[PDB]
Amino acid sequence: LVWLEAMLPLGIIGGMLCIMGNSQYYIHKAYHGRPKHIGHDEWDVAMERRDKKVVEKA
Amino acid sequence: MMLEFAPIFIYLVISLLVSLILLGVPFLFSRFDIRFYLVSILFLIFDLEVTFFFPWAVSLNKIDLFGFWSMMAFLFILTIGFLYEWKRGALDWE
Amino acid sequence: PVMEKLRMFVAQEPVVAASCLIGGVGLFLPAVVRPILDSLEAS
Amino acid sequence: MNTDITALEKAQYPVVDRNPAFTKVVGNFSTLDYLRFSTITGISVTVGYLSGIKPGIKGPSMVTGGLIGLMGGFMYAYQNSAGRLMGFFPNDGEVASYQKR
Amino acid sequence: MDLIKYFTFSMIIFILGIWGILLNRRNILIMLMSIELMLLAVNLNFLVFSVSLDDMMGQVFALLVLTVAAAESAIGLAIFVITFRVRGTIAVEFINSIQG
Amino acid sequence: YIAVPAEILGIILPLLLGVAFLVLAERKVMAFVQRRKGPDVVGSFGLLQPLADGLKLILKEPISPSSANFFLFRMAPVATFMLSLVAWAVVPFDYGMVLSDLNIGLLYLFAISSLGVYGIIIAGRSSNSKYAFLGALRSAAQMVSYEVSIGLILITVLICVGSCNLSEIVMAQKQIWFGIPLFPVLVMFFISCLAETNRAPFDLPEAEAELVAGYNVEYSSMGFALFFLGEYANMILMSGLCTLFFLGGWLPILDLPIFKKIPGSIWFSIKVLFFLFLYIWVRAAFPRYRYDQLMGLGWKVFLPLSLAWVVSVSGLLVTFQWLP
Amino acid sequence: MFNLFLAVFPEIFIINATFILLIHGVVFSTSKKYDYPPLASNVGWLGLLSVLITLLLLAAGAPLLTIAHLFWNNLFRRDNFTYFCQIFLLLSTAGTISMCFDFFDQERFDAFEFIVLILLSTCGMLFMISAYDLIAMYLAIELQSLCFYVIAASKRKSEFSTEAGLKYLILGAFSSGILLFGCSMIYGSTGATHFDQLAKILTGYEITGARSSGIFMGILFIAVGFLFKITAVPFHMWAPDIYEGSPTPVTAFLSIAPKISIFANILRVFIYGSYGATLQQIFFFCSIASMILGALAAMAQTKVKRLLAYSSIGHVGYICIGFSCGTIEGIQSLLIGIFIYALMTMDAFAIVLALRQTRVKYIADLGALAKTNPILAITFSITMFSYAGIPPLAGFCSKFYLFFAALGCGAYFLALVGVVTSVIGCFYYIRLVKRMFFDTPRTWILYEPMDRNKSLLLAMTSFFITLFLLYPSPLFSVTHQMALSLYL
Amino acid sequence: MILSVLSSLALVSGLMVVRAKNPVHSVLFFILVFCDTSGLLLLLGLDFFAMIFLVVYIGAIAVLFLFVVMMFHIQIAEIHEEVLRYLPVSGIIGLIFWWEMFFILDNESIPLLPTQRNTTSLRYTVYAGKVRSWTNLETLGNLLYTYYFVWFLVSSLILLVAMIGAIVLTMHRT
Amino acid sequence: KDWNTVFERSINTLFLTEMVRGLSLTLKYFFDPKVTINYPFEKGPLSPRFRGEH
Amino acid sequence: MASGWGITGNKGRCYDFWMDFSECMSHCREPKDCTLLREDYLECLHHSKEFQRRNRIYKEEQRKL
């Protein structure tokens, strides 16, 4: 069972990677109010720019 | 959209800052080998081959058979070049 | 007698033989099989 | 891929077939076409043999010359046959076989 | 004023290539690099114009000129290597035998 | 954009910790294979050994030899370290968890790979030592040689996906992971990653005993540390690409509700950890090639196979109209 | 689908034959079993055969080269002008190859890649002739140029050959960059690279007060590149050094074929596009400079190869006078001048390659050649008098035009320059006849007799040179056809 | 402003390519000029060309230049010359080229002067083009291999010539 | 020699079959007990004949 | 913009003007008959006259201020 000692630095690396993903995911969501959308194209950009007017001017 | 490149720039600046902090904190307390030219040439040729493959791979669904066969002819010419290089011992480093 | 010359060529140089086979299937399919499928679709 | 066989200069002879298929042009090969094919191939084999004697590779040189001649002669024969079927070259025999079948 | 600014960027690179030819009469390697700077400036011209005109022909040609530039550099440096290997030096005084 | 630095730091700092602990895990797994214990005195189970080595390294006096290339000598490790860090901006850890959703992210990764050679070349030249220069030239040649195969394998994957977006590449593996039909491509990709990171059995810079002085022989203190950290960060990245391209990234092994209970970042981490174990397992298993042997392998074995696989995959997909 | 490619049958054949020869050469030159045989002559004979089969395919398929012209329109344009230009280019290449076998065997130049590069550059010039877009024009020009850079440095241990290749690469890449900058200006100003689109955009306006400076400078830079290619003064100084330093068969090839192909490009670009006066004044002033400088510099030379280089510079000046006038007779005379200069140069380089077996270098080496080989001294004297334009030799034809255009376009300073430079040329050409016939040197050089290929080529070209003015109808008719087919 | 920063960086880096004493430094400053060009291309929205300039110019061409220059060990004496005497000729040539070419577009492409009025409100958006937009990569790949495939193949012939000529000129087999 | 023996030789080359065996035996010692002595709490064995400090 | 291929995958901004000018020039034996269409195409390419007019407006605003 001594070989579990080796599994600790590997588990720490895996946790480091999980932090690198999740921490940046939750900060973007807090700043924008919704999760980051994969594949933001020209249409989505134009929809956001139009939605700004349709919301604020309402 | 090019909006997604701005985080890469800010990332570069931060990486630079980290590099300088790590590197700076300690400051506080005549023989030409032609085989390298030849490997450079080979790499350049196949670099251009990967470059011409990128648009082809994303466009295969529109160009269909004509595009496939024109790329095959391109590869055939460059592979004849590769066979020439092989037979001439440009791929041998002993 | 070009039948063991191919055998020796496979024995000496298996990577070249495998590359030729893999790429040859890649070329053979669109050249031969694909017009067969297109014709079978026409009828 | 959009295509268009239309030539700049119009065919001056009866157009038997505008865009004849590959196998149709090959099957249209005449006696003169085979004579051109054979002459080109034989000359090419001969040049390969004669130029191969000094380096000592007359046989391999013969095969190389024969391949060059085979490709060139087939291309020439195809050129003539397809031009006849398309009306670009005098095509008496093509028209005689067309008006009957 | 966007188009003029991109254009002058490329133009300054082209002029820098010309000056690099003018300023390196003892340094033939820098002359080859000046020619590569001119070629880069031309490629930029084609890409900028392609954008400005909404036309794709400038991008097709930019890619092909890339292939040509790579081939030119490979051959150019091969000739430089054989020139140096024959003479033992790159000094311009050893490549001036042909004249008149 | 004001919170962008928080995201960048939440990527960079844990990456530097993960690298510190990758060095430890490499020393532990190699030790256990060799019936030894490995670092277990400095901290409980040796878990403070990375901190101790880093602090030792920053407390070491810099040397800075009397060379005419003072600036380039210090800049080369910065260059390689920066290049190793900046590739992670486009790496997706889970659906939506990525800093930059580049539509050209595949070509961007290839470009960073291509830039990686300059740190080694410049370190070798600026050192004013013919041993360092020769070792550097050989390492640079090996890297560019295996970049050709890496790029042609990238083309195979791109043909299957039809998009350079890394998240799209992952999500195209929902039906099946690409490492199942393209298992030989995965094998050749893992080997080409070993040769690109200068790792065993291709680690020429490690072969000092073999009369081969590495490009970083003259470096000390933190410049030497930056070279080492860039190399190890590249190994985690190459394990992440093996995961993204062929093991379906953050996706679960089976599309079942029991497997979808654990999040995608855990799946991605576990696959990355499998590949990092294999990098160490190979170091522990085999001897190393000579330079000429691995160069022959690069040009005569992996270029032809990679090219043949591009042709075969594109032809098969075009024939049966299975293209994306 | 397959029948569309009937328009590219000659090119397909020559490219595939070049690949076959490359493979054959590299496979059997490395063979230990055949003791690494020199394959330069073997591949040379096979490549000469390939060129002749390409010529057969092209000439016997005249209407088929225009098939699918709309599908092929955005790639190239084949017509009667291109048909005849390509036939002449293939003939030049075949003659030049036939003149190389003695050089391969006796100097033991064993590299078969020489033949492969010559064939690839022939492909490039074939594509140059049919080019109908700035992009295609540049690509074909670059392919041809890269092949020449490599063959100019073929004697890779010789100081002269390495020096020639280095100057060629630098000056050639510089000129190509200038020309590419001109293409970018034209594209930016007109949004068009196709020759038809450029024709429509630019006709009817020329300099109409509000002239596009972008178009004008694109034209100027493209013109500078073309003038470098044809070795017109002041873009000429690469030519004498490269001509001397290159291996003599390379010098023979570079003297003929590239000029045919670049003049085809110049016609189809300028005569066909429409900026007008400035473009022709460019060529007028460069023609004058070329005639004067070529005559003086040739008069100063003591080596045969340099004399021939400067003579070619002078003659391109004479030819470009025809392009300057901008009429049907101007184009016809340009084509006639190109054809006659090419045949004469082929004669001269056949003789030079024959004398290179005993290492001819100086004009004085030809002393007492009328005793040691009287019929060779007569053949060479005929070539020199033809170069000088003495009637009734073929060289008079081109000289006759120079004065015909000078008195047609109303230019008497051009006429005076022509009279003075013709006299100077006559002097330095008859100096060789004096050396071979009138001198009595103390030490003689005995020359080895030439091989059959060069004797047959020399006999034919010499009969043409002496007897063309007796039956000149076919060339006149065909060049008139080409001049007309430029527009219709 | 940003274009001014990139232009200034490229101008200094280019001067350093043409004026550095050491050719290794010259090749390194050339890499900086190519990086700056990549930035300009990113501004124009051409991300494929921006990446390819990195991959080909820096990743492959500059590497070849660096390998050759480094192994040549050029001595500063063989290539040194004082350049003060060329200031007048550089001045005249550069000034002619400046006055004539930095202002070649001005008559044809007249700049729109920025006014103290919001002209952004007159940008007309057409949503039909935005339903399925094309990247630079697939827009180029739609043309390279079908409508303009002959030029593609001629470029392959150019590359073949480079490979042949490199072998023939420099190979000395052991 | 034979298409079947040629085939097996080629497959063994391409699929690194002998490199798998070296990996497998390397992993077997990963899980086994270690031989390291926890000095200075634990010591190595010595004999009554040991020649140490005079 | 005479080829038709736009940089975003649609018909080029100035292709229709080019085609109008070309179709006019294909049958009008005098180039002056198609001058208006030609300057329409070139105006599309460079927006010279539009920007000149807007600069006139801006200049008048600066003058009246």
Curated annotation (Swiss-Prot), chain A:
Question: Where in the cell?
Answer: Mitochondrion inner membrane
InterPro entries from the xrefs?
A: NADH_Ub_cplx-1_asu_su-1
Q: What's the superkingdom here?
A: Eukaryota
* GO CC terms in record: mitochondrial inner membrane; mitochondrion
For this protein, the parts annotated as crossing the membrane are 1-21
Topology in the lipid bilayer is annotated as: Single-pass membrane protein
Q: Which UniProt keywords apply?
A: Electron transport, Membrane, Mitochondrion, Mitochondrion inner membrane, Respiratory chain, Transmembrane, Transmembrane helix, Transport
Write the signal peptide boundaries: none
Entry's family note: Belongs to the complex I NDUFA1 subunit family.
Question: In UniProt terms, what function does this protein have?
Answer: Accessory subunit of the mitochondrial membrane respiratory chain NADH dehydrogenase (Complex I), that is believed not to be involved in catalysis. Complex I functions in the transfer of electrons from NADH to the respiratory chain. The immediate electron acceptor for the enzyme is believed to be ubiquinone.
Assembly and interactions? Complex I is composed of at least 49 different subunits.
Its name, as the record gives it, is: NADH dehydrogenase [ubiquinone] 1 alpha subcomplex subunit 1
Give the organism the record lists: Arabidopsis thaliana (Mouse-ear cress)
Swiss-Prot record, chain B:
User: What GO terms are given for molecular function?
Assistant: NADH dehydrogenase (ubiquinone) activity
UniProt keywords (A-Z) are: Electron transport, Membrane, Mitochondrion, NAD, Respiratory chain, Translocase, Transmembrane, Transmembrane helix, Transport, Ubiquinone
The protein here is known as NADH-ubiquinone oxidoreductase chain 3
Q: Which reaction does it catalyse?
A: a ubiquinone + NADH + 5 H(+)(in) = a ubiquinol + NAD(+) + 4 H(+)(out)
Q: Which InterPro entries match?
A: NAD(P)H_OxRDtase_bac/plastid, NADH_UbQ/plastoQ_OxRdtase_su3, NDAH_ubi_oxred_su3_sf
Bilayer disposition of the protein: Multi-pass membrane protein
What else the UniProt entry mentions is: A stretch of 270 kb of the mitochondrial genome is duplicated within the centromere of chromosome 2 resulting in the duplication of the gene. The expression of this duplicated gene (At2g07751) is not demonstrated. It is also probably not RNA edited and therefore differs in all the positions known to be edited.
Entry's EC annotation: 7.1.1.2
Q: How does it assemble?
A: Complex I is composed of at least 49 different subunits.
The terms describing its cellular component in GO are: mitochondrial membrane; NADH dehydrogenase complex
The scientific name of the source species is Arabidopsis thaliana
Which PANTHER family is this protein grouped with?
A: NADH-UBIQUINONE OXIDOREDUCTASE CHAIN 3 (PTHR11058:SF9)
Q: What is its main location?
A: mitochondrion
Q: Where does the record say this protein resides?
A: Mitochondrion membrane
- The record lists the membrane-crossing segments as 8-28, 38-58, 63-83
Entry's family note: Belongs to the complex I subunit 3 family.
User: Which Pfam family, giving just one, matches this sequence?
Assistant: Oxidored_q4
Highest taxon in the source lineage = Eukaryota
UniProtKB/Swiss-Prot annotation, chain E:
Q: Name the GO cellular-component terms.
A: mitochondrial membrane; NADH dehydrogenase complex
Q: Which GO terms describe its molecular function?
A: NADH dehydrogenase (ubiquinone) activity
What UniProt keywords apply to this chain's record, in alphabetical order?
Electron transport, Membrane, Mitochondrion, NAD, Respiratory chain, Translocase, Transmembrane, Transmembrane helix, Transport, Ubiquinone
| Listed EC numbers | 7.1.1.2
For biological process, the GO terms are: ATP synthesis coupled electron transport
What reaction does this catalyse? a ubiquinone + NADH + 5 H(+)(in) = a ubiquinol + NAD(+) + 4 H(+)(out)
Write out the transmembrane intervals.
3-23, 28-48, 62-82
Q: Where found? A: Mitochondrion membrane
Q: How does it sit in the membrane?
A: Multi-pass membrane protein
What is known about what this protein does? Core subunit of the mitochondrial membrane respiratory chain NADH dehydrogenase (Complex I) that is believed to belong to the minimal assembly required for catalysis. Complex I functions in the transfer of electrons from NADH to the respiratory chain. The immediate electron acceptor for the enzyme is believed to be ubiquinone.
Q: Report quaternary structure and partners.
A: Complex I is composed of at least 49 different subunits.
The record's similarity note reads: Belongs to the complex I subunit 4L family.
Annotated NCBIfam families? PRK05715.1-2 (NF004320), PRK05715.1-3 (NF004321), PRK05715.1-5 (NF004323)
What is this protein called in UniProt?
Answer: NADH-ubiquinone oxidoreductase chain 4L
Q: What is the lineage of its organism?
A: Eukaryota, Viridiplantae, Streptophyta, Embryophyta, Tracheophyta
The gene behind this protein is ND4L
UniProtKB/Swiss-Prot annotation, chain H:
The EC number of this protein is 7.1.1.2
Leading EC class: translocase
What are the annotated GO cellular component locations?
Answer: mitochondrial membrane
Q: Does the keyword Disulfide bond apply?
A: no
- Residue ranges annotated as transmembrane are 48-68, 86-106, 150-170
Provide the primary localization: mitochondrion
Q: Where in the cell is it found?
A: Mitochondrion membrane
This protein's membrane topology, according to the annotation, is:
Multi-pass membrane protein
* A single MF term (Gene Ontology): NADH dehydrogenase (ubiquinone) activity
Ordered alphabetically, the record's keywords are:
Electron transport, Membrane, Mitochondrion, NAD, Respiratory chain, Translocase, Transmembrane, Transmembrane helix, Transport, Ubiquinone
Substrates-to-products reaction catalysed: a ubiquinone + NADH + 5 H(+)(in) = a ubiquinol + NAD(+) + 4 H(+)(out)
Keyword Electron transport in the entry? The reply is: yes
Where does the record place a coiled coil? none
Q: Which family does it belong to?
A: Belongs to the complex I subunit 6 family.
Q: What else is known?
A: A stretch of 270 kb of the mitochondrial genome is duplicated within the centromere of chromosome 2 resulting in the duplication of the gene. The expression of the duplicated gene (At2g07731) is not demonstrated. It is also probably not RNA edited and therefore differs in all the positions known to be edited.
Assembly with partners or alone: Complex I is composed of at least 49 different subunits.
Q: What does this protein do?
A: Core subunit of the mitochondrial membrane respiratory chain NADH dehydrogenase (Complex I) that is believed to belong to the minimal assembly required for catalysis. Complex I functions in the transfer of electrons from NADH to the respiratory chain. The immediate electron acceptor for the enzyme is believed to be ubiquinone.
Protein name (database record): NADH-ubiquinone oxidoreductase chain 6
- UniProt gene name: ND6
